[PDB]
Design a protein around this ligand. Structure first.
Ligand SMILES: *[C@@H]1O[C@H](CO)[C@@H](O[C@@H]2O[C@H](CO)[C@@H](O[C@@H]3O[C@H](CO[C@H]4O[C@H](CO[C@H]5O[C@H](CO)[C@@H](O)[C@H](O)[C@@H]5O)[C@@H](O)[C@H](O[C@H]5O[C@H](CO)[C@@H](O)[C@H](O)[C@@H]5O)[C@@H]4O)[C@@H](O)[C@H](O[C@H]4O[C@H](CO)[C@@H](O)[C@H](O)[C@@H]4O[C@H]4O[C@H](CO)[C@@H](O)[C@H](O)[C@@H]4O[C@H]4O[C@H](CO)[C@@H](O)[C@H](O)[C@@H]4O)[C@@H]3O)[C@H](O)[C@H]2NC(C)=O)[C@H](O)[C@H]1NC(C)=O
Ligand SMILES: *[C@@H]1O[C@H](CO)[C@@H](O[C@@H]2O[C@H](CO)[C@@H](O[C@@H]3O[C@H](CO[C@H]4O[C@H](CO)[C@@H](O)[C@H](O)[C@@H]4O)[C@@H](O)[C@H](O[C@H]4O[C@H](CO)[C@@H](O)[C@H](O)[C@@H]4O[C@H]4O[C@H](CO)[C@@H](O)[C@H](O)[C@@H]4O)[C@@H]3O)[C@H](O)[C@H]2NC(C)=O)[C@H](O)[C@H]1NC(C)=O
Ligand SMILES: *[C@@H]1O[C@H](CO)[C@@H](O[C@@H]2O[C@H](CO)[C@@H](O[C@@H]3O[C@H](CO)[C@@H](O)[C@H](O[C@H]4O[C@H](CO)[C@@H](O)[C@H](O)[C@@H]4O[C@H]4O[C@H](CO)[C@@H](O)[C@H](O)[C@@H]4O)[C@@H]3O)[C@H](O)[C@H]2NC(C)=O)[C@H](O)[C@H]1NC(C)=O
Lengths: 52, 126, 110, 104
């Protein structure tokens, strides 16, 4: 949370529908912080949603 | 003015691990990069890695990044080499050195500006 | 092996000029001015002589200078001296936030 | 004229110069809301960058509708910034001051 002291961007990962309709895979993609919002006030602040 | 102390030589068997240290002196440990180059005895030089000591960041080489887990700590004012799965080829003298000036608004790690270099110490393996 | 190629050795009598050449590719040394030179007299650790093709640190006289052209670069050694019997190493920025060292060449005073 | 349609929120970019002098204008200076545009006599050079050096990943969402995203970051992290030559900025701001005094 602090060892950067410069705008490093988060490293989130999610599930995307692949070319098949009912097959899935785990995939990762970076996003700058203003695009991402936390999903709940719970102590588990490790689940995020796009700002849209 | 500036000098870099390094941990002494040691012996290891193949497949082992080594953790060489590099302690600073004569300059602010933050405001310069820290560097490592490898020299097998009687052979040419080679590059290992970079560290921005103000962070945990590393740029380490493609061939050795899997083999290298170098780190640092500001309290000891020291940057630590680390090696694993150590083969017979790795027998060499490891020189610690100071890189370009670091701050905001640009990245100097590419610059091979090695103003100062350390004692250098030998790892032996066979 | 090194990406960057150097000859084995060169030699000459004192008072004569000598030059050495690096040679890389269009990428790596060919695309940037970030090339540097380092000397290793025997036993001891290497020494810092040139950075950014043609700039000097303190303690390096005007005997030494460098040049770049294409995928190659060079060192200038004007007026060889007796204490010069040492190796010289090339090293330059290889892109991708990585530095590469050449095998260097041995200079021998006659 | 070949109007540049460039979007910008808080300073105009690459616009046309004022030919002879700094000029000031507003629908009704008496009220704050009506923005007091200014059209400068000389340009102020502005430069920006973002030296992180990102890299593009590809992901194959659905039937062949590819989606792009920032992959790994080969390099070292640095701040994204904009630069202006300070003395020129202070000079042009002061001259806008004198023209504001011509209106105030
Ligand atoms: C947008 O705007 C921003 C600004 O907001 C721009 O950001 C700036 O960009 C420039 C360009 O990249 C950066 O310049 C570099 O700065 C570094 C660092 O310099 C600072 O720190 C030095 C160290 O400070 C410490 O020591 C001083 C005492 O010296 C002490 O008082 C202090 O408290 C601290 O403890 C300062 O010395 C230095 O100030 C000096 O130099 C200034 C410039 O000459 C001068 O204005 C000052 O008045 C003062 O004289 C400054 O505060 C520099 O190191 C770097 O210059 C080196 O590297 C370039 C390559 O990038 C090279 O061409 C130069 O020749 C120079 O190389 C020498 O130094 C290297 C290490 O510093 C060394 O590796 C070289 O071998 C060489 O070595 C020298 O010493 C050896 C002995 O050690 C000797 O043998 C040699 O012969 C030689 O003498 C650049 O100047 C700015 O830093 C940066 N701003 C900030 C805040 O970071 C941005 O660029 C803009 N955006 C765009 C897109 O343009
Ligand atoms: C954001 O966070 C995500 C996590 O959600 C993170 O992704 C993970 O990154 C790590 C590091 O890059 C990945 O680790 C690798 O895992 C593979 C596993 O292999 C199996 O699965 C993959 C995935 O499909 C298949 O491609 C593969 O065929 C296997 O089925 C390991 O094999 C990797 O090991 C090698 O690389 C390591 C890198 O350090 C070495 O340490 C290790 O010793 C191995 O090296 C050897 O193999 C290399 C070739 O692979 C070779 O080049 C070397 O020379 C050496 O011989 C590696 O551990 C992990 O898989 C990622 N997770 C997912 C789901 O993909 C992101 O990295 C993070 N964002 C950023 C920017 O870091
Ligand atoms: C920002 O990030 C980008 C990443 O997207 C960085 O761009 C990459 O830069 C690297 C380095 O320039 C570049 O890699 C080279 O691409 C060349 C082709 O254009 C390759 O030929 C070269 O490969 C060498 O090694 C291979 C394996 O050994 C060989 O198969 C190949 O023939 C090359 O080998 C020759 O050269 C090497 C030395 O390079 C030598 O040792 C060999 O003996 C032989 O002579 C490189 O892979 C990437 O292609 C760039 N990325 C992209 C997408 O183009 C960019 O540098 C970053 N920004 C900054 C400022 O660093």
């Amino acid at each position: 949370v602090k060892n950067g002291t410069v705008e490093e961007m988060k490293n989130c990962s999610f599930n995307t529908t692949t070319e098949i309709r009912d097959k899935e895979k785990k995939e990762y993609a970076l996003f700058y912080k203003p695009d991402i919002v936390p999903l709940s006030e719970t102590n588990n602040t490790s689940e995020y949603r796009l700002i849209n | 003015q500036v000098q870099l102390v390094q941990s002494g030589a040691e012996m290891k068997k193949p497949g082992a691990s080594v953790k060489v240290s590099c302690k600073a002196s004569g300059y602010t440990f933050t405001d310069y990069y820290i560097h490592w180059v490898r020299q097998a005895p009687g052979q040419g030089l080679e590059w290992m890695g970079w560290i921005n000591p103000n962070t945990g960041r590393t740029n380490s080489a493609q061939k050795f990044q899997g083999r290298v887990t170098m780190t640092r700590d500001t309290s000891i004012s020291t940057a630590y080499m680390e090696l694993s799965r150590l083969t017979s080829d790795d027998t060499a003298v490891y020189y610690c050195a100071t890189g370009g000036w670091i701050g905001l608004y640009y990245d100097s790690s590419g610059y091979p500006n090695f103003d100062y270099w350390g004692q250098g110490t030998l790892v032996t393996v066979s | 092996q090194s990406a960057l190629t150097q000859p084995a050795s060169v030699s000459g009598s004192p008072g004569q000029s000598i030059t050495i050449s690096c040679t890389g590719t269009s990428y790596d040394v060919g695309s940037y001015n970030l090339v540097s030179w380092y000397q290793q007299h025997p036993g001891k650790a290497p020494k810092y002589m040139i950075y950014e093709v043609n700039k000097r640190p303190s303690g390096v006289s005007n005997r030494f200078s460098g040049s770049k052209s294409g995928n190659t670069a060079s060192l200038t050694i004007s007026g060889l001296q007796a204490e010069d019997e040492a190796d010289y190493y090339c090293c330059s920025y290889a892109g991708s936030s990585t530095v590469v060292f050449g095998g260097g060449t041995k200079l021998t005073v006659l | 004229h070949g109007i540049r349609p460039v979007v910008s929120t808080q300073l105009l970019l690459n616009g046309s110069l004022a030919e002879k002098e700094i000029v000031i204008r507003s629908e009704n200076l008496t009220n704050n809301a009506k923005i007091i545009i200014v059209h400068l006599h000389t340009p102020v050079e502005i430069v920006c960058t973002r030296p992180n050096n990102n890299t593009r990943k590809s992901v194959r969402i659905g039937p062949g509708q590819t989606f792009y995203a920032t992959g790994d970051i080969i390099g070292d992290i640095k701040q994204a910034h904009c630069n202006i030559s300070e003395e020129k900025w202070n000079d042009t701001l002061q001259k806008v001051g004198i023209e504001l005094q011509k209106h105030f």
